[PDB]
Structure formats: structure tokens, C-alpha cells
């Protein structure tokens, strides 16, 4: 439905009427130029008069100055409406996927929704504004070329106004045929493209098992299947326009044969028969464009109703009303059982896990099928199915989501770096209240500044993409710095260090023990240093915990934790 | 570049002459139709004949049956040439891409290199065949129209052959301006889509730090920078064609004003004035295309030199002549040191590692330092820098590389499945010598067959992409069946199935222990049962050997065996 999209375009109505009257005036500029062919052959090369050939080059430049200006104005004042509309409805998309849950981002829709901001909204504004250019402009061309034809010779224009529905019907059925094989072939193109992607993706096993002559013989059958499909693109799209221009020229022959009729027709001068038989050649592109506009507008509305799936999608549930000033209370799981959205296997059994205030709790393992999931549930990235993760005596759903996520603070080696200054990157969404003094003391407290003070601009450098691209261990260091300035009683650590950097690890672990000196830390473990610094060690195997306690009690009976 | 591409198009040369003589006949069919306006305005309507006006409709259709036929013939016999040249250039890319090293596929060129098969190999012959349609057709239109003007009015055609270089120069400089702005803007379009991508990959750690109103104040400054950049296309792509058709209309008005002179007029009849003023309107699309063919042919040959580097890159080095029928000898690492291509840190330091025949060398190390690296070195995926790995008494280089990889078979649940039959997936690269009795017995030895006994078609179903999409465990078990039938003397198992499965592992472990009861089997260890079953455990951590010996000696001296 177009009526959903119209309140977006409704503020920019003036550009649609200024260019709307600059498309009628553009199509009444080549119409009044084909109407100059009557007083050129009748009055300049019929009756000999040089006078019409004196001002005729002047109006020929005049109508082309008008046509050029009116073509620039209409293609700027529509592409300002169709630029501001896509700007508005893609910055409304972005404001609706910054509140839509992580499970929506977690492989329900991948990073290709970048293309659903950049391409799928430009295609709406370029197929609904290109379907107004060929409705106003070619509609005014059809209207104006059927006035000057009716003014000069009504006898041929009656035949033409009969025949032009027949030529439009022919254009519709011939274009609908190509639209049938194309949208049917689309699937075999997808199959034949993934069939060549798959063999290239298995390159290593191709070289190992020795099928560099079998896979060659299989690429002699899929490339031959791409060739024999690309030749059916051109056996269907290049039979279309020869058929269209032959049915259309049958109208060019019927009007020409009807102009041989002795008395009812053939009272037409040379200029009149030049105007009628040159407007007909100029009637072919208005007839082609006005017949295929509904297959262009419904390529814009088919993407607009694709974009509005997101605009009516459910955002993240902020169904809580209480605000946490500081989470001094200890967060504790209570009968919590969780299942991943989009899957049926549960990643969390019925588990009570207490994280005491000021005491770190380790998560020792590699995958666990639930280790990073447990870290995600405290931040409420994925909403809980049943159970209650009690936070200061109340469940997470009781609190407002922004104040809930203010208490938690993840730290990762794969942390995100914005295209901002490192002063604002340290203090994201806290630039106004938290001044530069707190930022520089917190950067010095985490021992970050030894890298920052030696940079090109100090605390003004751009770190992210199209930036200086700071180090992998410096990503965790800048995550310590963002974890600093406090107001974060809960810390989430992964430690993806792997290869420890020499002489920077001595400051990284110093800042890490500064991070874990107080406050309710929950760390997942790949380093035995964080393991022996842990207080209550938690180990999850195959999505469940059985064994808990400190390192000594888990060292008394080995199980799978010790080795 | 075209002199290197012409040996590929030279077998398909008969389609380029049939279409090349159909494009000329197509361009000489609308020229002979604009030559039908002289004996229609003079001999038809000027001198009232009625004999002219009945044969004229039959040549209106007579030159559109010809125009349609030669528009279909020349667009089927060039898209058969530019389908077969694409097919040959795809089969030759692929044959020079299953012999390339893995280091080419490893981060030197990612999964978009399939585009070089699909899009880029199509782009070269959709821009070198479209630059021949333009040269032959619109260069035969210019020739044809410029025969027709000099036949009909030589006075109003010397002016044309003066002005059409000036219009051609104008089109060239105006289109060069648009190409300059576009190829300059390209970088800023990439910058703004990157700066929109990076906010969207980081949805998490925006909700955490609270920046859901800072992020929509930065998208208000990049979506306002894609808007103002689309408005610089439409202020540069929409000022081009008005300027072009105003400069051309200046030439049209100069020719119209020159036809008012008594030297030029009184030799122009009422039909001659129509032909040299309707073929000039039909001279615009030949003049616009023939000054932009070099901006098309140099986008095809510049898309031909991004694929003739892959056709000129060095393949993987088979600089060996010895063949191994069966390698019962011990694989001995002798002073082997290896660094990754594209990086400077060594992923494998100076290492001596004994792999005994029939004994399992479990790599109990972790964190991705040198296990998957050494599993690639034994197969000679990436060639060695210094040192020598000795395979039955000689280095891998001395051997032919195909037999060297025939000795070794990787086993993984990350192994690739092809879109062939299951029996041919078990007997890949050898299905004619290896009969189906051996395939059935080897699938029975791997305990997988029952699942394929309950599949849809027995040992005949398609299993790859657009297939049944088998389980992760049965993928590892069908790799077991493959390595069982192929009888590889040296085994490399990765053990990606740390999370075991009920009812599958009872046969998976039996098949695994059946397979590694023999063979020089190096195994990457992540499951403690294979660690217990191992003979000589070798630890690798951050590039170097830590401990060597059985697990009891590693129990006596702990080190990182427990870690
Ligand atoms: C030194 C030199 C200097 C001199 C120059 C002087 C310059 C003066 C002005 C110069 C510019 C003028 C402005 C202008 O040009 O405006 C034009 C508006 C009119 C203004 C002119 C006013 C007159 C001046 C005043 C004079 C003095 C006062 C039209 C236009 O619209 O303009 C352009 C328009 N050109 C024409 O229509 C020529 C038109 C001209 C229009 C008619 C004007 C009348 C002429 C006046 C004569 C004067 C006599 C006195 O035809 C002709 O030549 C006619 C030739 C003679 C006519 C014969 C009759 C005459 C008398 C008869 C009785 C006696 C062009 O069309 C496309 C072509 O497609 C088919 O090709 P195919 O061959 O099929 O592959 C046609 N096949 C045909 O039509 C053949 C037809 O079947 C013929 C029969 C039709 C049926 C018959 C009747 C049907 C009846 C209907 C039933 C009801 C071609 O026709 C050709 O070439 C063919 C060939 O040559 C000629 C045909 C020969 C047969 C005809 C003769 C028959 C004889 C009868 C026998 C008795 C046709 O050309 O699309 C452009 C937009 O697209 C662009 C862009 O340009 O930006 C490029 C796009 O890519 C294009 C492309 O490359 O074009 C366009 C795509 O949409 C698509 O088309 C694609 C492929 O083509 C698709 O497959 O590629 C794309 O990029 C896009 C952008 O990405 C986003 O939008 O935008 C338009 O631009 P835009 O509007 O500015 O944006
Ligand atoms: C999706 C598929 C598309 C298929 C497309 C098919 C196209 C078929 C044709 C459609 C357009 C037909 C337009 C007909 C216009 C006729 C105008 C006319 O006859 O006016 C000429 C007339 C002069 O005639 P004459 O008497 O010879 O001259 C002597 C001068 N005193 O007088 C004049 O000089 C001027 C008189 C002005 C009259 C204006 C008429 C406007 C017509 C508007 C039609 C709207 C189209 C549909 C929109 C629906 C809106 C609800």
C-alpha cells in the first residue's frame, strides 16, 4: 500500500509539485517542438517564406533551453524528494534496529540488513519516483501528442487512438512474458551460482582427495548450464523488442495506408503528415513506459512492504519500571532455564548460580554450550523463557532495560570501536556529564595512556574503521578504559588474549586486577591466573553444571575440570 | 589486453561475422526507412500519386521484419559468442584456481573471488560485446546516415560533417566530467557505507553503554551525507544530457538556419528537408554511443586485467618427481620452522616431532597456535620456509604433490560435502577403479550405512547444497567412511566434536578406533578419551613444543598438561 509511504513524502510535497509541473512542461516542450514541423514544411518549404526559417532556429534553441532546464529541475527536485524520503525512512529504519533485540541480529537477519538500509530503501525511492517520472512525463507526452495530432489531423488521430490500446496491450503481454521466464529462471540462477560457490568452498578437500580433474569435469557442466541460461535471457529479452516494434509498425503501416484514402483522408499537407508521422515515432517510448510503470511501481512497493516488516516488528521489551542507582546487591540465578530462539535444544538446564557482591566467579571451559549464553542473560540480550535471574532481590524484567544494562559492563578482545575520539570512545553516552578529567584519570588508572599519549593526536584520535585501527590487546585495554569511570557493579570478561604481548601483559593484568579488585565480576576462563584469582569457580559442561566451589575442592576430585 | 583475449574469441569467430553482418543490416534497415520519407513527402503527398502510398506500408513492415530479424540474429549470435567466451574464460579460471596454493584462498582473496568466475568474467564480455554492437551498428548508422544526407542534400551535409566532430567533442568532455566526479565520489560512497556498516555490526555494546541516542545522532550525520552525495550524482548526471542536447540543438539550429539561404534552398524539396532533419535526430544515439565506446571497452579490458592476473599468478609448486605408492615410513620433522604467508610472526618455531607408524600423536595443546598449522604442513598446503619434514626417508618437495596428498586424509566434521551421490562422496576422485562393493563394505565398516540405509534414495541421494544437508556428526562419520575406503597411510584428525551426542557416539568412537587402529595418525586432541588413548602426547603452546611423551609422564611433570 502506497498510503503508508505517503506521510513520509508529505513534508516534501513542494518538490513533487515543482518537479511535477517541470515534467508536464518538459513533455510540452518536445511536443511543441514536433509541432514546429507543421510551419516548417508548409510555410517554409511549401509556400516559400524565409521568415519562418529565421525565427524557427530561435524557437528550436528556445524549446531546447526550456527542455534542458525543465529536465534538470525535474530530475533535481524529484531526487531531492527521493533523496530526503530515503534519508528519512532509512534513519527511521536505523532508529528501529537500535531497539530491536539481539536475537533479531543473531542470524535471523545477518549483516545483509546493511543492504536493507542502503539498497532496499534506495530501491523504494528510485522505483516510486521513477514511476512518477513515467506517469507525469510520459502521461503528459501521451496527452500532448494526442492534442497536436488531433489539432492537425483528426482523421489519422482517431485511428491512432484506436490502435494505441492495441499496441499497449501488445507491449503488456510481451513484457509480461519476459517477466515470467525471468522470475521463473531467478531460482535456477541462484542454484547454478551456489553450485559453483560450493565447489570453490571445498578447495582444500579437492586438493587432498585428488579431484582436480573430477571438479573440472563438474565445472564443465555448470558453466555450460550458466551459458545455456544466459542464452535464454537473450532468446527471451531480444525477441521482445523485435516483436514490440513490429506490432507497433503495423500501426505505422495502418495509419500510412489509411492516409492513401482519397477524400476523407489525404486532405493532409506535407507539414501535417510530417507532424503526425513523427509524433507516432515519439509515441513509442511513452507507450512503452506507461505500460510498464505498474511493473516498476510494484517493484518499489514490493520493497516498501519488505521494509515495513521491520517498522511493524516488535522491539526489545522494556516492560519494566524500576531504575537501579547502583547494583550493590548480589545477582543470583533462581530456577533459570533458557532456550535459544530459532532452535529447540536448550542451552541452559535448571540452574541456581549465585554471584556474590565483590567476589568474582569464573567460567572455566571453551564452549560449554551455554557459557557465553549465561553472560548474555545478565545483560538481557535474549529474554528469559522461564526462571528468574534475581538482581538485588528482584527479577531483571521488573527493571527498566537501560538502567539494567547500565549496571553491567562487558569487556572483550573483540570489542567494538566507534569512529569517534578516544575521549568519547572511553565515555560513550557519557560525554556530557562525565568531563575530560574523569576520562584522563580513568585512562591512566587502566594504564591505557602509555599507548594513547604517544599517538598522533592524543585523546582525539579516530580508532575504528577508516582510523588508526588499534591493537587486539589494545582492544581489551580500551575495553578496560570503557569499563572504567565506574557506575558498573557487574563486569563480564571473556579474555580472548591467546598470544600474550610481551611487556604489555604486565600492565594489562595489572589493570585487570584493578578491574576485579571490587564489584561483582563474572569472568569466563581461558587463563589459569584468572582461575586462581577467582573466588567461586563455576564450570559448565554440555550446557549444565554439576560441580561448583573453589579451586581446591575442584582439585580434590578431578572430573573433567582438572584435565 | 584484447590481443591476449582474441585467441579465446577466435574459435567463436563465425558468430561475430554473422552478427557483425546482421548489425550492419540492422543499421542499414532504419537508414533505408528514413530514406522512405523523401518519396513520401515529395512523390506521395506533394505529387498526389496513390501508387506510392500502397507500396510504402509494405516497406514500412518490410524494413521492420528485417530490423526485427537482424536485431534478434545479431543479439543471439553475439550473446552466443559472449556466452561461450565467458564459459571458456570461466572454465580456464577454474582450472587455474584448483591448482593455486591454499595461501591464495587464505585471506589473500576471500569468498568474493567467486565473483571473478561469475560477475567479472561476465563483465568483460558484456562490455567487449556491447562495445562491438556500438562500433558496428552505430558506426554503420553514422556511415549510412552520412551516405543518405550526401545523396539527398550535399549542401546540408558538409555542415553536418563539420558540426558532428564538435558535438562528438562536446559529448566526450561532458561525459568525461561525469566519469571524473563519479570515480572521485566512489571513495566517499565507500566511506559512508563503511561508516554505516560499523554501527550495525556493533548493536551489542551499544545497548550496554547506553548509546542508543548517540548512535541515532551519528546516523543523522551520515544519512545526511549519503543524501547530499546522491544529490551530487543528480546535479552532475542530470546536467550532462541537457548540456549535450542543447549543444546538439545548436547544431540543429545552425543547419536549420543554413537551409534558409537561397543557395541551399530551392534545391531542397519537401522530402529532402524531412530526411536530413529526421536522420539528424537519429544521428544523436549513434553519436552519443560512438563517443562512449572507449569508456565501455576500457571497462571491459580493465575488467579483463583483473582476471588475467589470476590467469598469470603462480600455481602451487609441484616441483617433485618421486611417487609414494604407500608410505609406511615414519614422518619425521627435522629442524622444521614455518611462518604464515601474509604475516611476520612465526606460527611454528624450530620443532622436531616424531610421528610413529600406527601410533597416535595427540596435540593436547590449544588456543590456535600451531595445531591447525601443522595439520596443513603435512599435506603441503603452505610450503615450508626452512627445515625438512621427512616422509618415508625424503622431504615432501622431492615427491609429486598429488601422490603426497593421496597418502594423507583429513577427517573432520567441518569437511566439505559435494553435490554428488553418497557413494561417489565416499569414493571421490576414484569411482571407476573403486567399485560399489568396496564402497558398501567401507560404509559398513564406518557404521554410517544405517543412516544412509534410512535415507531417501539409499546410496544415491544428493547431499551437498540444494540437498538433504546432513548432520554434523554424520559428516564426520562420512569422512570416516571416505578415509576408510581410500586407505590413507597417514591420518590427520582434528576432533571438532567436543560436544558429544547420544546414540551417535557409540558408533562414532567404534568407527574412529577402527580407523586409527593402524596408520601413522597424528590427531588434534580436544576430547579426553583420545587423549587417554594416545601413544606419544606432544604439547604445542604459542609456537613451540612444551612436553613430549606419554600422558603418565605428563601426569608426573604437569606443566600445561592439566591446563
Ligand atoms: C551533428 C548531429 C547533431 C544533430 C542532432 C540534433 C539534435 C536535435 C535534438 C537532439 C536530441 C533530441 C531530444 C530527444 O532525443 O528526445 C526526443 C523527443 C523529440 C525531440 C526532437 C524534436 C524534433 C526536432 C525539431 C526539428 C525541427 C523543429 C525523443 C527521446 O525520447 O530521446 C531519447 C530517446 N531517443 C529516441 O526516441 C529517438 C527517436 C526520436 C523521437 C521522435 C522525434 C521525431 C523526429 C523529428 C523528425 C523531424 C522531421 C522534420 O527516434 C528517431 O530516431 C526518429 C528518427 C526520425 C523519426 C522518423 C519520423 C520523422 C518524420 C516521419 C514522417 C516524415 C531514447 O530512445 C531509446 C532508443 O531505444 C530504441 O532503440 P532500439 O533500436 O530498439 O534498440 C529506439 N528504437 C525505435 O524507436 C524504433 C521504432 O521502433 C521505430 C518505429 C516505432 C513504431 C512506429 C510508430 C509506432 C506507432 C505507435 C502506435 C500508436 C531507439 O530509436 C532509434 O534509435 C531507432 C532509429 O534510430 C530510428 C527509427 C527508424 C524508424 C523510424 C522511421 C520510420 C519512418 C516512417 C516511414 C514512413 C531509441 O533511440 O531514449 C532516451 C532516454 O534514455 C537515456 C538517455 O538518453 O539519457 C539513455 C538510456 O539508454 C537507452 C538509450 O541508449 O537510448 C534508453 C533506454 O530507455 C532503452 O531505450 C535502452 C535501449 O534502447 C532499450 O532496448 O537504451 C538510459 O541510459 C537512460 C538512463 O540510464 C535513465 O533514464 O536515459 C531519450 O532521451 P531523454 O528524453 O532526453 O531522456
Ligand atoms: C496503462 C496503459 C497506457 C495506455 C496509453 C494509451 C493512450 C491512449 C490515448 C490517451 C490520451 C487521449 C487524449 C485525447 C486528447 C484529445 C484532445 C483534443 O481533441 O483536442 C484537440 C482540440 C482541437 O481539435 P480540432 O477541432 O481538430 O482543432 C480545431 C481548433 N479549434 O483542442 C485543442 O487543441 C485542445 C483541447 C484540450 C482538451 C484536453 C483534453 C485532455 C484529456 C485528458 C485525459 C486524461 C487521461 C486519463 C486520466 C484520468 C483522470 C481521472
Swiss-Prot record, chains A, B:
The lineage of its organism: Bacteria, Pseudomonadati, Pseudomonadota, Gammaproteobacteria, Enterobacterales. ATPase activity is stimulated by lipid A, hexaacylated lipid A or Kdo(2)-lipid A. Inhibited by the phosphate analog vanadate. It is a multi-pass membrane protein. Signal peptide: none annotated. It holds the Pfam family ABC_tran. Its EC number is 7.5.2.6. GO terms for molecular function: ABC-type xenobiotic transporter activity; ATP binding; ATP hydrolysis activity; ATPase-coupled lipid transmembrane transporter activity; identical protein binding; lipid binding; lipopolysaccharide floppase activity. InterPro entries: AAA+_ATPase, ABC1_TM_dom, ABC1_TM_sf, ABC_transporter-like_ATP-bd, ABC_transporter-like_CS, ABC_transpr_lipidA, P-loop_NTPase, Type_1_exporter. It comes from Escherichia coli (strain K12). CDD domains: ABC_6TM_MsbA_like, ABCC_MsbA. It comes from the Bacteria. This is ATP-dependent lipid A-core flippase. It is found in: Cell inner membrane. Involved in lipopolysaccharide (LPS) biosynthesis. Translocates lipid A-core from the inner to the outer leaflet of the inner membrane. Transmembrane domains (TMD) form a pore in the inner membrane and the ATP-binding domain (NBD) is responsible for energy generation. Shows ATPase activity. May transport glycerophospholipids. In proteoliposomes, mediates the ATP-dependent flipping of a variety of phospholipid and glycolipid derivatives. May also function as a multidrug transporter. Changing residue 197 to Q: Improves basal ATPase activity and increases transport activity.
